[PDB]
Design a protein around this ligand. Sequence first.
Ligand SMILES: CNC[C@@H]1COc2ccccc2O1
Ligand SMILES: [Zn+2]
Ligand SMILES: [Zn+2]
Ligand SMILES: [Zn+2]
Ligand SMILES: [Zn+2]
Lengths: 69, 71
Amino acid sequence: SQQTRVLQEKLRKLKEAMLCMVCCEEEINSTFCPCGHTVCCESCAAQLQSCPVCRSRVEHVQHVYLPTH
Amino acid sequence: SQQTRVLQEKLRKLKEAMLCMVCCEEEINSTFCPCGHTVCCESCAAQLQSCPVCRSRVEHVQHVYLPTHTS
Ligand SMILES: CNC[C@@H]1COc2ccccc2O1
Ligand SMILES: [Zn+2]
Ligand SMILES: [Zn+2]
Ligand SMILES: [Zn+2]
Ligand SMILES: [Zn+2]
């Protein structure tokens, strides 16, 4: 039904929100510290000097284990 | 249809996976450091001296800003 289509769209958007903002291919699993933006996969986060969201200096990257992984 | 019920269940399970494992009421937004388990809201994470997943000591809690975060 049309309701089935609406739910498919919501599921797709939620799943897309869990993907890396740089490569759009791998799941987010890394946090820029200390700002806390958690928007990249490990490969993309490794090479950034500043947060791509707020421009804060990245002191280090913390790996995150999320239940959604 | 039956597929509407199947999709409702998938959406419910994905949303439940983003809720705190202790209170079951608030969204996850905190990481236990250094183990990295990210399974609690800020209120439950503040009260735990050991990670509830792996029992490693919590040195500190890092707040996480996730694109999935909602109000
Ligand atoms: C994921 N938890 C965020 C919110 C923020 O404001 C809060 C205020 C009072 C109780 C809980 C609260 O939790
Ligand atoms: Zn990436
Ligand atoms: Zn940032
Ligand atoms: Zn909680
Ligand atoms: Zn842990």
